[PDB]
């Protein structure tokens, strides 16, 4: 084998402790760059003029943040969707003031995670597996794309990307509620059904399988030792599990087919989260939650408030208070 | 910053005490007969 042939054999090698692969060839440097930039910025980045109004927001630990408050702050509203790599700045000081780390990090991250997904396919192919784990991973990934790329595109600025921080995340959420009434959007409700439901079925499945483990141990040892890695025989009794759950609700509401069950387990959270992601990604173009403001009117024409209108009042508080120095004109049009 | 001056010891003992408990248990597990 020549050098290229050997290299190809190593890259795609199934014997590497961590699979590399061709997707990995892109993934590794981008994720390393993104990670290093993120960590360094999170500790040491100076405040960033996120909203382009020469009002810099401090995101880093050394500039007065803790873990909950800390963030890598989104690039300046003055930049918008302009590509702002380090080399477009006259200096690192300028790059930092205008939030360059945000763009570097999110672009490398999105590239790297796309490659992570491809890499999941690739390894599944190398191991003779079915290929669709990566499709499940498409659910969280799309969501990241929604908040780091699609929303900024729709609104015309990366300053509207989700900040890389916990409280910044909350800021993004509150402002999103103010501007799109996301709670009242059916795609977000499907998202919620997705994660609540995902958790429910995770706990449920966990509990039923745990409930029907076959006795292989004594009381003075963990039941986990009752299973040996790679054993051929199933470690629990699915017939008993189904017997239980089928009586808990009713027979035909219970899975007796493990494959159908696990497919359901995969599909519910993945599809739901796909809808969450599409929710963010379509509210990115301002097709917003249901608006029932003043939907209920009495015979004279008096407005009769519903819970939607109270939501509306909260939303109003959010709208009027956010970015208190950024608006000169009465409507927030993007 | 005007942080709580006990936050350091609180965090340090919060990490160290159970971590140490776990290390004790692991290490005494390893040294048992194979």
């Amino acid at each position: 084998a020549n050098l290229w042939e050997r290299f190809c054999n190593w890259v795609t090698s199934t014997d590497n402790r961590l699979y590399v692969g061709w997707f990995g060839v892109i993934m590794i440097p981008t994720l390393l760059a993104a990670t290093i930039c993120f960590v360094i910025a999170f500790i040491a980045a100076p405040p960033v003029d996120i909203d382009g109004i020469r009002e810099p927001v401090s995101g880093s630990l050394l500039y007065g943040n803790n873990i909950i408050t800390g963030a890598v702050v989104p690039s300046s509203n003055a930049i918008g969707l302009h590509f702002y790599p380090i080399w477009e700045a006259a200096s690192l000081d300028e790059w930092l003031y205008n939030g360059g780390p945000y763009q570097l990090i999110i672009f490398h991250f999105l590239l790297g995670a796309s490659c992570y997904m491809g890499r999941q396919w690739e390894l599944s192919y190398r191991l003779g597996m079915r290929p669709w784990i990566c499709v499940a991973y498409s659910a969280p990934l799309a969501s990241a794309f929604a908040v780091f790329l699609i929303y900024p595109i729709g609104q015309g600025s990366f300053s509207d990307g989700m900040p890389l921080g916990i409280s910044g995340t909350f800021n993004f959420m509150i402002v999103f509620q103010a501007e799109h009434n996301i709670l009242m959007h059916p795609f977000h409700q499907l998202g919620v059904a997705g994660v609540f439901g995902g958790a429910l079925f995770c706990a449920m499945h966990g509990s039923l399988v745990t409930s029907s483990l076959i006795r292989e141990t004594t009381e003075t040892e963990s039941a986990n030792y009752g299973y040996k890695f790679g054993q051929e025989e199933e470690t629990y009794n699915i017939v008993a599990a189904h017997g239980y759950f089928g009586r808990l609700i009713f027979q035909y509401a219970s899975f007796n087919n493990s494959r159908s069950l696990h497919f359901f387990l995969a599909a519910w959270p993945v599809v739901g989260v796909w809808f969450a992601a599409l929710g963010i990604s379509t509210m990115a173009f301002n097709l917003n939650g249901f608006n029932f403001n003043h939907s209920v009117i009495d015979a004279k024409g008096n407005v009769i408030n519903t819970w939607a209108d109270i939501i509306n009042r909260a939303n109003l508080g959010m709208e009027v208070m956010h970015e208190r120095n950024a608006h000169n004109f009465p409507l927030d049009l993007a | 910053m005007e942080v709580n001056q006990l936050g350091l010891i609180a965090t340090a003992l919060f990490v160290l005490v159970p971590s140490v408990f776990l290390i004790i248990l692991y290490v005494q597990t390893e040294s048992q007969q194979k």
């Binding site: 961590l18 630990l61 890695f229 790679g230 | 990490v15």
Partner: peptide, 30 residues
């Protein structure tokens, strides 16, 4: 001192990632 604490805990977590991956108890088929 807060920052030192936060970064310290983070670094401990990353090191933990390292040991948990490369120095895990190997899975063995019985």
């Amino acid at each position: 001192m807060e920052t030192i604490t936060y970064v310290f805990i983070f670094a401990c977590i990353i090191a933990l990632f390292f040991f948990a991956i490369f120095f895990r108890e190997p899975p063995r088929i019985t």
